[PDB]
């Protein structure tokens, strides 16, 4: 190959390149010609004496950069950025084209590059950028960084600036971070950008936001501060997304969340409580959205919410006072109002978070059971009982039948309350009693709603809570069918004197018990004996449920000028039938004959006298102020005149009401005994023998689905069973 002289060609391309650095005025011709002349031949020239040529190029670039620095330090103080940008783009294009053309002579020789970094040709591919970093970047870096930070702080206050200058300067910063570890590594090194601009910017941001947040909170309420912080966070993420490198982004977010939100958490907590005292749901939503960013920052919010719900429920139930113990409606409605309000709040403002739902459930499951009403009832088994009674008042016949949709909503609300009560066997017992007493007297407003209620209970608890109820329904249907069949038989034989209804109830299902002795009047004797004979001919192997105090009906009196129909119970029927011969009877003789207890007979006597169907010895004597002694005489009020033909006298008694309260006490104690023994001794037998401590701990979670056993009770059961373990 040829070896042409060095100085002439060297000066030639030196003049060519110093022309090329200036803006192009000629055409493409010499641009191809000179660089082709270099590429084809001077590969050897630019290799060995190319060291001297490149040193001369380096010193030429050094003087050029010194000239630029001298010409670019006149006044500036803000116009530094325009100069730095324009020069950066121009020098970038010039260096890019020069490095694309001239470096091809010495590049692609990775074999020589590996050895000692190709002597002094190490990383000189970007030696233009190296000279930019050393000669010009070093003197002006402080000034340009200060100008950029001043512009950013100026934009933060509200003014508008040309973001292109900042974008260009930060792109230049990240560009000079050459990857010296590997010349072919896919990924930039941000060493210079991090060490010269990022740390200062982050410190300035944290200082500015500390100062601004403190000054704002010192002279404003918390709500406006939350409003401002929510906007500031997205503002400072948009800044990075627009005119800053991506590597900063995440870090910057952290810093903002460490200054605008976390450091003020204490204040937030207090404000949270105040918000709960005013019910400002949107502000609560904003606070939840803000605190969601801080990790493990939601726990105190959950504790405060649970405590607030508990206190609100306790206060709301206490405010009712003494009237709750006898009015199920207000108790259940207060509970439902509190639960509905706070569940709506949790679902709307707090975005139905699992932890907040658990907090609501824990708060509601602690003031259903232990509140003022049960505390003054001296037993935690008052919350279920009242609930059961409420259901009764929703299904008995009333003057204003509730709307079907309203009824279904109310039953669903009763279920969402019943989900919380600890003692559920008490609820089952009281519901069974109320259902039996409603079915016998046929007080059911509608069979469809009642069947829906039973279905809801079955889904809630299982088949045990509804097996007995389904048995009762089937028994009442069978009794209706048997009554129809006996009516058919009567139509096929001698008919009865009066139309009466009879129901046969299996003794193994219904809770009724026989506790009184009675003497049959001669009027019902023929029906009694005929029915007993017929049932003996029909059924065997069981025992008839013959009860009289639960039997009522209607009677017609021929002893009044205007024919009246009196609906009354069997005891009143016997009392009136005894007057068919003699209208004047003494109380002792009535007790001896009718076999009615003194309290029941006395109560029936006041009920009859108040209705004016009977009279005492003195007709003008006040019934309430006159005591009924065994020698008291009662006479029939023959001249009974009234506007209404049909008269009801079978009214539940206040003394019978208190007796029923005593029977509820007996029901509660029966629940206690049955519960304890026949539901813990069996499971203790089931568990066999163990260490006697974890056994106690784990037997509580096998019966927990229907009550909660008490530790002394289980200890007593173990002591009783120690005879046989």
């Amino acid at each position: 190959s040829k070896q042409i002289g060095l100085d002439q060609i060297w000066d030639d391309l030196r003049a060519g390149i110093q022309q090329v650095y200036t803006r192009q005025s000629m055409a493409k011709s010499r641009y191809m010609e000179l660089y082709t002349h270099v590429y084809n031949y001077c590969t050897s020239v630019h290799q060995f004496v190319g060291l001297e040529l490149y040193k001369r190029l380096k010193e030429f670039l050094k003087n050029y950069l010194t000239n630029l620095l001298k010409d670019g330090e006149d006044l500036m103080d803000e116009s530094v950025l325009k100069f730095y940008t324009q020069q950066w783009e121009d020098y970038r294009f010039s260096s890019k084209v020069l490095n694309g053309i001239c470096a091809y002579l010495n590049r692609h020789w990775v074999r020589r590059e590996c050895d000692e970094g190709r002597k002094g040709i190490y990383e000189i591919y970007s030696l233009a950028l190296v000279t930019w970093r050393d000669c010009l970047f070093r003197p002006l870096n402080k000034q340009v960084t200060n100008a950029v930070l001043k512009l950013i702080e100026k934009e933060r206050n509200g003014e508008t600036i040309n973001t292109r200058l900042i974008s260009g300067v930060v792109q230049s910063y990240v560009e000079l971070g050459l990857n010296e570890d590997d010349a072919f590594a896919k990924g930039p090194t941000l060493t210079v950008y991090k060490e010269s601009f990022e740390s200062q910017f982050l410190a300035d941001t944290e200082r500015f936001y500390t100062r601004e947040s403190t000054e704002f909170l010192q002279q404003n309420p918390v709500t406006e501060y939350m409003k401002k912080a929510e906007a500031r966070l997205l503002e400072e993420q948009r800044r990075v997304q627009v005119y800053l490198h991506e590597s900063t982004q995440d870090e910057l977010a952290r810093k903002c969340e460490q200054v605008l939100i976390e450091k003020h958490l204490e204040i937030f907590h207090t404000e949270f409580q105040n918000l709960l005292d005013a019910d400002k749901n949107e502000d609560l939503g904003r606070m939840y959205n803000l605190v969601s960013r801080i990790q493990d920052g939601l726990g105190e919010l959950k504790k405060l919410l649970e405590t607030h719900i508990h206190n609100q429920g306790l206060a709301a139930i206490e405010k009712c006072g003494e009237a709750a113990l006898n009015d199920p409606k207000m108790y259940v409605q207060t509970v439902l109002d509190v639960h509905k309000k706070y569940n709506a709040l949790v679902m709307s403002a707090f975005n139905n978070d699992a932890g907040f739902v658990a907090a609501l459930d824990k708060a509601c499951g602690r003031f259903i059971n232990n509140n003022a009403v049960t505390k003054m009832a001296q037993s935690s088994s008052k919350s279920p009982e009242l609930l059961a009674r409420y259901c009764d008042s929703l299904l008995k016949k009333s003057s204003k039948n509730p709307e079907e949709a309203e009824l279904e909503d109310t039953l669903n609300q009763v279920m969402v309350v019943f989900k919380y009560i600890e003692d559920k066997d008490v609820f089952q017992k009281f519901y069974a009693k109320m259902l039996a007493k409603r079915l016998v007297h046929q007080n059911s407003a509608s069979d469809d709603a009642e069947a829906s209620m039973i279905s809801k209970l079955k889904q809630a608890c299982g088949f045990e809570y509804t097996s007995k109820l389904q048995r009762m329904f089937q028994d009442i249907g069978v009794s209706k069918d048997l009554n129809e069949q006996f009516k058919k038989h009567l139509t096929n034989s001698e008919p009865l004197d009066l139309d009466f209804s009879i129901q046969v109830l299996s003794s193994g299902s219904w809770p009724f018990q026989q506790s009184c002795t009675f003497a049959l009047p001669s009027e019902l004797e023929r029906s009694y004996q005929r029915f007993t004979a017929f049932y003996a001919s029909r059924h065997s192997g069981r025992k008839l449920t013959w009860l009289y105090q639960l039997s009522k009906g209607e009677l017609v009196t021929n002893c009044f000028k205007n024919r009246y129909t009196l609906q009354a119970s069997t005891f009143q029927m016997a009392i009136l039938l005894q007057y068919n011969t003699e209208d004047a009877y003494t109380v002792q003789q009535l007790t001896d004959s009718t076999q009615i207890k003194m309290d029941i007979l006395a109560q029936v006597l006041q009920i009859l006298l108040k209705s004016k169907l009977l009279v005492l010895e003195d007709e003008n004597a006040n019934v309430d102020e006159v005591e009924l002694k065994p020698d008291t005489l009662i006479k029939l009020y023959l001249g009974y005149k009234n506007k209404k033909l049909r008269v009801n006298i079978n009214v539940p008694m206040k003394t019978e009401q208190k007796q029923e309260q005593e029977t509820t006490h007996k029901n509660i104690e029966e629940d206690r005994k049955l519960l304890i023994q026949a539901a813990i001794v069996r499971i203790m037998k089931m568990r066999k023998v163990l260490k006697h401590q974890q056994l106690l701990g784990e037997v509580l979670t096998q019966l927990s689905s229907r009550f909660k056993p008490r530790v002394p009770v289980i200890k007593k059961c173990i002591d009783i069973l120690i005879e046989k373990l």
């Binding site: 192009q24 508008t160 403190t214 997304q241 405010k319 003057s399 079907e404």
Partner: protein, 1176 residues
């Protein structure tokens, strides 16, 4: 080897020998082993299902609930190959006729559905089984439970059944005609639940099928036939009415025709359907609003049985439905508020006398909804308003109030609790909307309140509601109206304080405190003689406060009420003043009444009655000093406030020993950890310095040291610095032998003095600003101590021997001493400052410019002519001189610059023709702040300059008017709002500079005050988009070799327009067209890189601000994003292009993910395939 023989050993235990033990055996089988307790031999699992067939109907099913709570995890631990088998066997035993296996089958299938090709197949099998049960199984007990499970399963499984939905509707259509309405109602409910996610055409099929069977061909029909159809219509209404607008126009007349029929339940159904349609479809129901309205206005009055059998009437249901319909109509359509006030509000009022209870409650709720609708916009209830539309509504309500009061007068003494509570709530709402309107009716309302305060038999709820109503009335109505009725109103309230129910006592105490704070204001002369009442007030409050067995709430309320009573009527307590104070002192010691007692003591001290707090000063001061040591922020703030108030009130009548004791604690409080406490402590120190200087001798040292250490911090707000300034004012004004200034700057400069090398770790520029500002403010605080040192510092600092910090601090201190208290004369300072302005250091140059600017304002008539002469003769250093002029006009009041202002004008535009950008900008702010001298007279000159002048002049004018925007309200706001049109019409100028400056003006206006441009947006938006489009004339691809990047000069205006577009997006969303917005987004997304990033941010924001238009447009929006992501750049590219391509790819990925967060976008193939390619 744990779960290898353990399972098989227990298998032999289920051979009917451990029936009692089987219950525990299964519970033990389910234990903490749910990690890898699965192996081969599914024979064990089929034996398990066979044995759980024995945890079933047998033994009366006693272990069924526990059995299923155990099998839940068991039936999820079954694996798919047995999942199909168990589903099949559950279906087969559902076919079984036992009425017991079906329950377990259903609940187990529900558990399986909750846990979950195979899944789809088992779901199809379940749906087919349910359909066969509903249709084929013609027995009630199976259909009812099948519908139950189907409804409870659609409630959470809407989407997986999309294939079977079309068939399901069919099996549910004849069910609306079956007998035994127990199935019919649940069929209607299930159909309503289904018609919530039934595709988009299935709902149409259901609607136009249900419509067909409804009408009668102009012939009456039995109501039983159409009742269920109308009920189903109402159900689908309440569920998904927003999909029935197309059929509303044909459904409404038929429903009205049926409503005209004579049936109570039918009328109920029709009115409920109308309510559902009105609340769910407001726009489509427009042309039908009048007709239905008339119906309501009739049937709200419908009550034939009552002249103007209790178990067989339902007209009250008709009236309740009508009232609810009226409420829904009122709430749905605010646009027709005035018309309602002429047609709806009167009739409603006439129905306040409804005989029923629920009807009356709903009428009250409707009127309350109307009242809340008439509410004027919040945040403006502080001044009178012009007679706008809201003015007309408020006038209508003000004319309405007398009729409401007259109609509600009788009910306030009703026997029922509910009616009185309703009246109280309604009157509270009416008073809240219209303050000061119920005063004329006070003789009535007060009477009613008394009737609810003497009530004894009923619950305490009515009493508490009466007290709350009285408290609200005291809050709203003016005090004077209560004067005549005080003798009758006051006793009962007091009688409620001594109640045995503590809630009533607390409420009475709060009401009493409000009453005494309102009737006898603090800072005004007393119009009502308080002698007759104060004795009883004090007796009741003291008797309630002296019982220590009471509750906490009553204790707190009593303490607060007694504090207010003392503070407002200390004159009239008399002999009870001395004991009462002591009581408060005692409550100041307990850990449960610290804060209420502190607040009461603060309020007592603040009051202007000039009380004699002598007996308790020492004890209170010692207790508060003890409280200062505890580490509680709220308690510390309360204690500092109490101490400050007490010292200010007492003045010179306080013991010295207690002062020293409390002062011994303060130096620990002055720290940078908390700033509010430090400010309060410094204020208290200043107050006690002003009061009793002699107590400061032994505490000056540590206090001064901690104050200096606090001033070191760069985070001092203005309040702390002002408090420190006042502290030093007092400390020098007292002329004490301890500290008397001349030490703050010294100590602060002590580290600065040791900085003998100007190359070490200097402060940050903002740290420089903060520290030097604090130091200079301290120097300028006291002028008497620094009078001679002001001249001394110039002489001792003009020598260039001191470091840069001393120099800059010298100029800043000179500027501050000339600014704070009188302009420093310093007749020879002008030459020295001018000489030093050309300092080699930039910080010293900025300090000198600030010094000249701040000293010129204080002596403008003398220096302003000199400064203008220097500018005219010597234009060489115009930059710093122009900054000084800007600062001068900034710090000089306009009233003192009016005579000469025009002269400055003649200078400023004289230099506007230069080619320097910075000088042009500085002149722009100078003009902008000069306009503040007189806006009305100086604005037209700038307007005419913009209209006719050199572009370099109108550019500066528009920059100045842009800088004229202030964030706070400013007097030029009306003038700017009126005159902004001419300025905004400047974009027609072809010059780049004017258009860019106007775009910046618009951006600033939208960012700061959207009201300036809002009303004009419709005349701005179109022409603004004209700037968005790319202009190729400015685009010049200059010939730079073969390859060259085009130097587009029209990029800045596009960037400014896009910034304005983002600002409108964030602030003015309500006055934009989304279609053209997205079209311009698409047009600009292909523009330069910066525009690409900003458009990506806009798309990300719009993915949350308008999901539907973005979902519609994404089908084509993805293609630019896909091209941007899939573009391949050669590896020979230098680092700039690699970084840019990576950044744009990541931004496009973020935009794609933001779009993907929308569920509908997730159901298209293009981005699913794009995500699959990204993953691969």
């Amino acid at each position: 080897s744990t779960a290898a023989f353990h399972i098989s050993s227990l298998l032999e235990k289920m051979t009917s020998s451990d029936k009692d033990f089987r219950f525990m055996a299964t519970s033990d089988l389910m234990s903490e082993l749910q990690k890898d307790s699965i192996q081969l031999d599914e024979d064990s699992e089929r034996k398990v299902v066979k044995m759980l067939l024995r945890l079933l109907e047998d033994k009366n099913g006693e272990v069924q609930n526990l059995a299923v709570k155990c099998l839940g995890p068991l039936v999820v631990k079954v694996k798919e190959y047995q999942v199909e088998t168990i589903v099949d066997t559950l279906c087969t035993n559902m076919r079984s006729d036992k009425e017991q296996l079906r329950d377990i089958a259903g609940i187990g299938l529900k558990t399986v559905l909750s846990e979950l090709g195979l899944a789809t197949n088992v779901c199809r099998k379940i749906t087919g089984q349910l359909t066969s049960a509903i249709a084929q199984q013609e027995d009630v007990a199976v259909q009812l439970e099948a519908l139950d499970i189907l409804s409870d399963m659609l409630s959470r499984l809407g989407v997986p059944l999309g294939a079977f939905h079309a068939s399901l509707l069919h099996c549910l259509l004849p069910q609306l005609s079956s007998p035994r309405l127990a199935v019919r109602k649940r069929a209607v409910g299930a159909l309503g639940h289904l018609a919530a996610a039934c595709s988009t055409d299935l709902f149409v099929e259901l609607a136009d099928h249900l419509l067909d069977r409804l009408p009668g061909p102009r012939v009456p029909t039995s109501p039983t036939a159409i009742r269920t159809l109308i009920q189903c219509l109402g159900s689908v209404g309440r569920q998904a009415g927003h999909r029935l607008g197309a059929h509303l126009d044909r459904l409404v007349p038929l429903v009205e025709d049926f409503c005209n029929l004579d049936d109570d339940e039918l009328r109920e159904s029709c009115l409920q359907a109308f309510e559902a349609f009105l609340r769910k479809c407001p726009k489509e129901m427009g042309p039908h609003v009048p007709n239905v309205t008339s119906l309501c206005l009739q049937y709200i009055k419908h009550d034939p049985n009552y002249n103007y059998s209790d178990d067989d009437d339902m007209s009250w249901k008709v009236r309740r439905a009508a009232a609810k319909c009226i409420a829904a109509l009122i709430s749905s359509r605010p646009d027709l508020l005035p018309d309602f006030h002429c047609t709806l509000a009167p009739v409603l009022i006439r129905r306040f006398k409804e005989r029923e209870e629920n009807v009356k409650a709903d009428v009250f709720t409707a009127y309350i909804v109307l009242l809340r609708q008439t509410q004027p916009p919040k945040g403006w209830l502080e001044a009178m308003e012009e007679p706008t539309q809201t003015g007309s509504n408020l006038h209508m309500l003000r004319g309405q109030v007398p009729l409401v009061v007259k109609a509600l007068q009788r009910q306030l003494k009703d026997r029922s609790v509910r009616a009185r509570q309703g009246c109280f709530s309604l009157l509270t709402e009416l008073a809240g909307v219209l303050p000061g309107s119920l005063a004329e009716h006070m003789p009535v309302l007060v009477s009613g309140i008394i009737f609810s305060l003497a009530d004894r038999s009923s619950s305490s709820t009515i009493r508490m509601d009466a007290l709350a109503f009285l408290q609200g009335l005291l809050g709203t109505e003016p005090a004077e109206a209560f004067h005549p009725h005080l003798p009758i109103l006051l006793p009962p309230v007091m009688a409620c304080v001594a109640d045995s129910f503590y809630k009533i006592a607390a409420e009475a105490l709060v009401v009493l405190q409000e009453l005494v704070r309102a009737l006898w204001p603090l800072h005004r002369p007393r119009m009502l003689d308080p002698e007759p009442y104060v004795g009883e007030m004090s007796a009741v409050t003291l008797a309630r406060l002296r019982a220590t067995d009471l509750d906490q709430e009553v204790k707190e309320r009593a303490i607060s009420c007694m504090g207010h009573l003392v503070g407002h009527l200390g004159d009239r307590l008399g002999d009870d003043l001395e004991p009462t104070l002591l009581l408060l002192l005692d409550r100041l010691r307990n850990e449960i009444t610290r804060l209420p007692a502190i607040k009461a003591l603060t309020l007592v001290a603040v009051s202007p009655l000039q009380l004699d707090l002598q007996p308790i000063l020492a004890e209170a001061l010692h207790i508060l000093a003890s409280f200062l040591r505890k580490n509680q922020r709220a308690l510390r703030l309360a204690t500092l406030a109490a101490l400050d108030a007490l010292a200010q009130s007492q003045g010179l009548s306080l013991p010295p020993s207690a002062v020293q004791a409390v002062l011994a604690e303060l130096p620990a409080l002055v720290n940078e950890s908390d700033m509010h406490v430090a400010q309060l402590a410094v204020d208290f120190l200043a107050t006690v310095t002003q009061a009793q200087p002699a107590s400061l001798v032994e505490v000056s040292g540590p206090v001064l040291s901690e104050l200096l250490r606090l001033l070191r911090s760069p985070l001092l707000p203005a309040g702390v610095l002002a408090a420190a300034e006042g502290f030093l004012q007092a400390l020098v004004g007292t002329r004490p032998p301890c500290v008397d200034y001349a030490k703050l700057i010294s100590l602060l400069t002590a580290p600065v003095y040791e900085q003998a090398v100007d190359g070490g770790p200097g402060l940050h520029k903002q740290v420089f600003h903060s520290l030097a500002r604090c130091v200079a403010a301290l120097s300028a605080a006291c002028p008497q101590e620094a009078a001679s040192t002001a001249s001394r510092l110039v002489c001792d600092a003009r020598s260039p021997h001191s470091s840069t910090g001393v120099k800059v601090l010298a100029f800043l201190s000179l500027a501050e001493v000339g600014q704070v208290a009188g302009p420093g004369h310093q007749r020879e300072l002008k030459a020295v400052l001018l000489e030093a302005l050309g300092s080699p250091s930039e910080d010293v140059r900025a300090a000198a410019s600030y010094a000249l600017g701040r000293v010129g304002a204080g002596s403008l008539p003398d220096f302003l002519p000199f400064l203008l002469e220097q500018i005219e003769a010597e234009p060489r250093r115009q930059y710093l001189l122009l900054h000084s002029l800007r600062e001068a006009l900034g710090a000089a009041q306009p009233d003192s610059l009016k005579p000469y202002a025009e002269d400055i004008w003649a200078l400023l535009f004289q230099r506007c023709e230069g080619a320097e950008e910075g000088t042009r900008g500085v002149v722009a702010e100078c003009i902008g702040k000069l306009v503040l001298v007189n806006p009305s007279f100086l604005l037209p000159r700038l307007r005419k300059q913009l209209a006719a002048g050199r572009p370099h002049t109108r550019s500066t004018v528009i920059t100045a008017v842009k800088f004229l925007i202030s964030d706070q309200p400013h007097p030029i706001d009306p003038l700017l709002k009126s005159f902004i049109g001419e300025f905004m019409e400047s974009l027609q100028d072809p010059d780049l500079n004017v258009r860019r400056a106007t775009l910046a003006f618009f951006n600033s206006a939208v960012h700061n005050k959207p009201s300036l441009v809002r009303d004009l947006l419709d005349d701005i938006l179109p022409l603004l988009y004209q700037e968005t489009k790319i202009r190729r004339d400015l685009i010049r691809e200059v010939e730079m070799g073969p390859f060259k990047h085009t130097v587009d000069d029209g990029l800045d205006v596009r960037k400014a327009a896009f910034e304005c577009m983002y600002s409108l997006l964030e602030s003015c969303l309500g006055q934009l067209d989304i279609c053209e917005f997205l079209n311009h987004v698409e047009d600009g997304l292909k523009d330069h890189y910066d525009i690409r990033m900003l458009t990506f941010i806009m798309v990300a924001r719009l993915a949350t601000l308008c999901p539907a238009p973005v979902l519609q447009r994404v089908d084509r929006l993805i293609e630019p994003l896909r091209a941007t992501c899939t573009a391949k750049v050669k590896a020979g590219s230098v680092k700039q292009e690699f970084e840019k391509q990576d950044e744009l790819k990541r931004s496009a990925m973020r935009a794609v993910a933001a779009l993907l967060t929308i569920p509908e976008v997730g159901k298209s193939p293009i981005m699913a395939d794009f995500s699959s390619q990204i993953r691969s």
